[PDB]
């Protein structure tokens, strides 16, 4: 079925910019919003962002809005995490997720291994 | 008749943000296309007509475009005062008139997941011969959620009804409450009751639950 | 300023008949086309009904023709529509508007004043009051009250008489399968406050003069 491979992470200075991407391969996935979530260790998860279907838009957690942007690549079936202005507290493991309602319920069913982004 | 189709239905931009509402006719209608704006609970309020005429006393930043089967109306610079239903209306098949089925407009705001609270039946409900089981899902954004109710582990269908507050005015959130309804009988059959809760801000499902009579 | 209101709403069972009356006042109602629209609750606007200045020209939704008629009186500013034959798909808010255009007035065919609109609610439902029951319950706990079985809208709910508002949110009804309406309230509240503050819901229905006080209190 689909496989998630998220990209893009590793060390970086703060005030720094890193890309992360979000590539799946075994489904087309432009029919469905994809999520961005993060876990720094022995802490809960969180939700970052979500890239709703072209044309419906895009949503943001309290701590990434105005740093972070969600972004698509439908052609090449893969979105991205932009992220800009980056401090020590986002260091995290990040993590890409499918939600497999259409209709943006959030049922997250598929989910990347994750990369490592170090902020210090 | 004329069928005119009308997208999106929620509309979700940042105050400042350009937007734009579409409505396209089945057949051509020329110019003669309306618009109106719809406060909750106030009346329809025409904002352009023939297709991209400004009404008097209409702010600048509504304009309409379009000839014939597709239309459009911007607001170059959303205000606070635009969230509200927008329909668009077509004039020259007539009768009957027609309208689009309406876009909602509302202010985006950051992702915040509900909090989640189940409610048993109270005794004084049940002595009475039926059984409502209340699950709350409290201050969240974006508006999209899913419940399901669980008995005794099975998947519930067809015996639940949903209702959705009004976006918050101070803080921009929905909440929603799911009811379950059962005979007093069929409940008193099972033990555990659960309602199962799904939004893009959780990254888990989360479920709250309680066990009858304990 | 112009103006328009709409009168003639209420409950009605369903294959009986109700009249709604527009007053107009403001510009020359004589000289415009107006017409009628509704609202189902929840729903989008539906053109109903129009007629021209002299009555002269009359126009029907394909869902009511047969059974509604619009009328105008202009010697008293009026609009009418007889609404025959009634069913529950029928209920709806009733809005009459007035045209741009009309005689001497070409070229542009808006809506450009609206009444503030009558409900007309088809039902076989009779008057009763709801039934109340407590919803009972981290730092922050809900509470609440379910009320039940009510006919027609609206109930009000407050909290401790109207001294408790903050987190307090009371859902829209529903209309249930049986014709009757439904709705709770709730409220958070610190989770420390429940063993030592006391939370009751007070419901009114007007229409039949029921008033509940129902104390919400733990398991």
């Known amino acids: 079925e689909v496989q998630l491979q998220e990209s893009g992470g590793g060390l970086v200075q703060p005030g720094g910019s890193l890309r992360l991407s979000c590539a799946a391969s075994g489904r087309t996935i432009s029919r469905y919003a994809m999520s961005w979530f993060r876990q720094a260790p022995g802490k809960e998860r969180e939700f970052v962002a979500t890239a709703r279907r072209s044309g419906d838009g895009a949503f943001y957690a309290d701590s990434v809005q105005g740093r972070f942007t969600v972004s698509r690549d439908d052609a090449k079936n893969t979105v991205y995490l932009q992220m800009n202005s980056l401090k020590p507290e986002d260091t995290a493991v990040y993590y890409c997720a499918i939600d497999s309602d259409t209709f943006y319920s959030g049922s997250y069913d598929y989910w990347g291994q994750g990369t490592q982004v170090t902020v210090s | 008749d004329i069928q005119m189709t009308q997208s999106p239905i929620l509309l979700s931009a940042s105050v400042g943000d350009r937007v734009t509402i579409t409505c396209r006719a089945s057949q051509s209608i020329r110019s003669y296309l309306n618009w109106y704006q719809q406060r909750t609970n106030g009346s329809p309020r025409l904002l352009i007509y023939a297709a991209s005429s400004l009404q008097s006393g209409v702010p600048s930043r509504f304009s309409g475009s379009g000839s014939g089967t597709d239309f459009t109306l911007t607001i170059n610079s959303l205000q606070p005062d635009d969230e509200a239903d927008y329909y668009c209306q077509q004039t020259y098949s007539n009768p009957p008139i027609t309208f689009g089925a309406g876009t909602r407009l509302e202010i985006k705001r950051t992702v915040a997941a509900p909090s989640v609270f189940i409610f048993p039946p109270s005794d004084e409900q049940l002595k009475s011969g039926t059984a409502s089981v209340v699950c709350l899902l409290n201050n969240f954004y974006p508006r999209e959620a899913k419940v399901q109710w669980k008995v005794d582990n099975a998947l519930q269908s067809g015996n639940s009804q949903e209702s959705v507050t009004e976006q918050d005015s101070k803080d921009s959130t929905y909440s929603l409450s799911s009811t379950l309804t059962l005979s007093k009988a069929d409940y008193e059959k099972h033990k555990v009751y659960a309602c199962e809760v799904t939004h893009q801000g959780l990254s888990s499902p989360v479920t709250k639950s309680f066990n009858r009579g304990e | 300023e112009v103006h328009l209101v709409e009168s003639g709403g209420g409950l009605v069972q369903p294959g009986r008949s109700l009249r709604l009356s527009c007053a107009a006042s403001?510009?020359?109602?004589?000289?415009?086309?107006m017409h009628w629209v509704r609202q189902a609750p929840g729903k989008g606007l539906e053109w109903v009904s129009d007629?021209?200045?002299?009555?002269?020209?009359?126009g029907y939704a394909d869902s009511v023709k047969g059974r509604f008629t619009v009328s105008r009186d202009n010697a008293k500013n009026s609009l009418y529509l007889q609404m025959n034959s009634l069913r529950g798909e029928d209920t709806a808010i009733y809005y009459c508007?007035?045209?741009?255009?009309?005689?001497?007035?070409?070229?542009?065919?808006?809506?450009?004043?609206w009444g503030q609109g009558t409900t007309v609610t088809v039902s076989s439902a009779a008057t009763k009051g709801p039934s109340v029951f407590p919803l009972a319950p981290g730092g922050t706990a809900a509470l609440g009250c379910l009320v039940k079985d009510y006919f027609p809208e609206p109930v009000t709910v407050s909290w401790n008489s109207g001294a408790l508002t903050s987190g307090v949110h009371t859902f829209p009804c529903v209309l249930q399968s049986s014709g009757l309406y439904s709705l709770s309230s709730v409220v958070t509240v610190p989770s420390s406050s429940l063993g030592t503050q006391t939370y009751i819901c007070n419901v009114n229905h007007k229409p039949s003069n029921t008033k509940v006080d129902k104390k919400v209190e733990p398991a």
């Open positions: 508007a007035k045209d741009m255009s009309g005689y001497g007035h070409y070229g542009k065919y808006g809506m450009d004043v």
């Open positions: 007629i021209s200045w002299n009555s002269g020209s009359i």
């Open positions: 403001g510009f020359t109602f004589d000289d415009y086309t």
